[PDB]
Structure 1
Amino acid sequence: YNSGKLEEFVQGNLERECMEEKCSFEEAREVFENTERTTEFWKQYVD
């Protein structure tokens, strides 16, 4: 869930971060970065 140590400097993997453990909508919007794409994605991942 992006504790903020040695996982920000990695590439872009929405799974290792968002799927596996935990994650904010914002989190997606850094790798993903298309916040529209990520909100739709968000409506099948939130709740």
Structure 2
Amino acid sequence: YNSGKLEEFVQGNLERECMEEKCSFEEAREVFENTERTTEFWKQYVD
């Protein structure tokens, strides 16, 4: 059960734990698990 979408013990969102405030490009890289997906979205989030 490395994943199996536990969901009561997991993590994989952005709005919840990043938006309505401000965080960092780092950590986003970790959820998308690939550099390409993270800079090509965080681009919009910033300026």
Moved >6 Å (runs of 4+): 1-9
Q: How large is the RMSD of aligned CA atoms in angstroms?
A: 7.0
> How does the TM-score come out when normalised to structure 1?
0.59
Name the one with the larger helix percent: 1
Which 5+ residue runs of structure 1 have no aligned equivalent?
Answer: none
**Share of identical aligned residues, percent?**
100
Structure label with greater radius of gyration = 2
Do the aligned partners of residues 6 and 24 (structure 1) sit closer, same or farther apart at CA in structure 2, a change above 3 Å counting? farther
Which 5+ residue runs of structure 2 have no aligned equivalent?
Answer: none
Aligned residues: 47
